[PDB]
């Protein structure tokens, strides 16, 4: 009934937070290779953080319910980004509650307009931005140009989109977000949030007018208005009550946050490794896919017929997954293995580890769409088991629908010679933006 074998600090209090912030995965993998375990634990100013890396013992992390295992605690930061009583600031019954409002909102049912939807965005910024037919573009800040506007093209309202845009959206998401500093999720002791809170407090305005005007077409029936609005304000809780204001605008930006920077990174990923050409056998299996294909997607034809680009997708987020901690708050130990973690203790697990065990992924650097998890549950990226992603199906399709829809009447050449190497920077990761530089060419009859 022991615990972890701790990789030992030599700068104090400094914990291991340089060594971490410069290289994560050499860090963590040096922790693993030395310690002869892939469960270890590490000093973050003196907080013991406690690292799952034995794909094996995935099961352990994931399982157990929010009572043993607390995420709360430790994912705290997004507490005036979502608001008071919205997500982990509620309790966890009701935060479940909210959540089962918001899957229920990415059913397949709803999925059915969403094809057309994400297509006729892409399109439009083709036309705008790809005008020339030789042209020098920002991949990953036009990927995300792509999916702020697409996912507003699905979840939002006409008279939504009227009245808010995704371009001026996402410069309120970026208003809202930059409350965010990677090292302030361990000491649970703002400059940002005077900008923070009137990001909010101007959607918090727009929605509500929204809802002052729907109510007042309301009376006809007719207006007919079911996007991810619609179905929060007809939400009802399990004692009766409905969503305030606060807590519906709170899963609005909660909805688009989440997506919008982990989707644009896994198709920005994905469109750099097609577009290299040591990647060629894979770009033309995506073609053969793909040429058989009508100019106007429908739903079975990015979920039915298109197999091999989710291959892609995955691997993408396998290989260089934007979230690279998965994090707990220990309540009540359980067993780890043979191993076991003490109370106050912060368990995680590393996506970012685990997909780059040698069991699991041989070779972890190669991008392999053809590649299956060599052991079962290896991939986390989406998470797993009592917390799993409720985005996952929309993502996947929001991001084929874009492969699919730009390799069409596309072709590109990255500028670089090799794959941009990922920016540990920020939380959540992707590549290098000055390495993002690519130059596309359109296919001609
Ligand atoms: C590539 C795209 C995405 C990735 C990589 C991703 C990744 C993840 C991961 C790793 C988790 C687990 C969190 C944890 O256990 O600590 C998660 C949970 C979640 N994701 Fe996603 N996600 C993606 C897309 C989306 C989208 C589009 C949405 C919503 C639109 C979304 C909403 C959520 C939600 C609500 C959870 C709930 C976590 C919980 O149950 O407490 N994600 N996602
Ligand atoms: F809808 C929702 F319920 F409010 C919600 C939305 C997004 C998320 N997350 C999320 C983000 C991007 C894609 N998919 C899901 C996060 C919320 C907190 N989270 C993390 C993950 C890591 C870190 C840390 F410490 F590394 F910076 C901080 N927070 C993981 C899931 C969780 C809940």
Redesign the pocket.
């Known amino acids: 009934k022991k615990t972890p074998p701790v990789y030992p600090v030599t700068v104090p209090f400094l914990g291991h937070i340089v060594q971490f912030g410069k290289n994560p995965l050499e860090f963590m993998q040096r922790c693993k290779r030395d310690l002869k375990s892939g469960v270890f634990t590490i000093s973050i100013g003196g907080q013991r953080v406690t690292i799952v890396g034995d794909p094996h013992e995935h099961s352990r992390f994931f399982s157990p319910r929010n009572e043993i295992l607390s995420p709360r605690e430790?994912?705290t930061?997004?507490t005036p980004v979502?608001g008071e009583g919205?997500?982990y600031a509620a309790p966890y019954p009701r935060?479940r509650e909210?959540?089962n409002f918001?899957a229920e909102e990415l059913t397949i049912a709803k999925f059915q307009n969403f094809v057309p939807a994400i297509q006729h965005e892409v399109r439009k910024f083709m036309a705008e931005n790809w005008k020339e037919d030789e042209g020098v573009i920002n991949l990953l800040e036009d990927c995300g140009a792509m999916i702020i506007n697409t996912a507003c093209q699905c979840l939002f309202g006409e008279d939504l989109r009227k009245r808010l845009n995704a371009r001026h959206f996402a410069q309120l998401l970026s208003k809202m977000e930059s409350s965010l500093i990677?090292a302030a999720?361990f000491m649970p002791w703002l400059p940002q949030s005077a900008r923070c809170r009137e990001a909010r407090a101007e959607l918090q305005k727009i929605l509500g007018e929204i809802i002052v005007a729907r109510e007042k077409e309301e009376a006809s029936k007719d207006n007919n208005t079911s996007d991810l609005l619609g179905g929060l304000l007809k939400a009802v809780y399990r004692d009766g009550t409905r969503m305030s204001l606060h807590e519906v605008c709170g899963?609005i930006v909660?909805?688009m946050?989440?997506?919008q920077?982990?989707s644009t990174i896994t198709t920005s990923w994905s469109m750099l490794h097609l577009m290299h050409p040591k990647n060629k056998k894979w770009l033309d299996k995506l073609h053969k896919e793909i040429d058989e294909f009508p100019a106007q997607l429908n739903y079975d034809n990015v979920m039915d017929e298109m197999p091999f680009a989710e291959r892609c997708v995955r691997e993408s987020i396998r290989r260089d997954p934007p979230?690279?901690?998965?994090?707990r708050m220990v309540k009540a130990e359980v067993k780890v293995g043979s191993y076991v973690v003490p109370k106050g203790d912060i368990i995680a697990c590393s996506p970012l580890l685990s997909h780059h065990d040698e069991e699991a992924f041989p070779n972890p650097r190669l991008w392999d769409p053809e590649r299956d998890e060599k052991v079962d549950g290896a991939f986390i990226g989406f998470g797993a088991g009592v917390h799993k992603?409720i985005?996952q199906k929309f993502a996947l399709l929001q991001v084929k629908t874009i492969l699919a829809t730009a390799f069409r009447e596309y072709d590109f050449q990255l500028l670089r010679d090799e794959v941009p190497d990922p920016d540990y920077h920020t939380?959540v990761v992707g590549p290098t933006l000055n390495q993002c530089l690519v130059k596309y060419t359109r296919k001609k009859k």
């Open positions: 430790v994912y930061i997004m979502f919205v997500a935060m909210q959540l918001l990677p999720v899963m909660a909805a946050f989440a997506g920077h982990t979230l690279l901690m998965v994090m992603c985005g939380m």
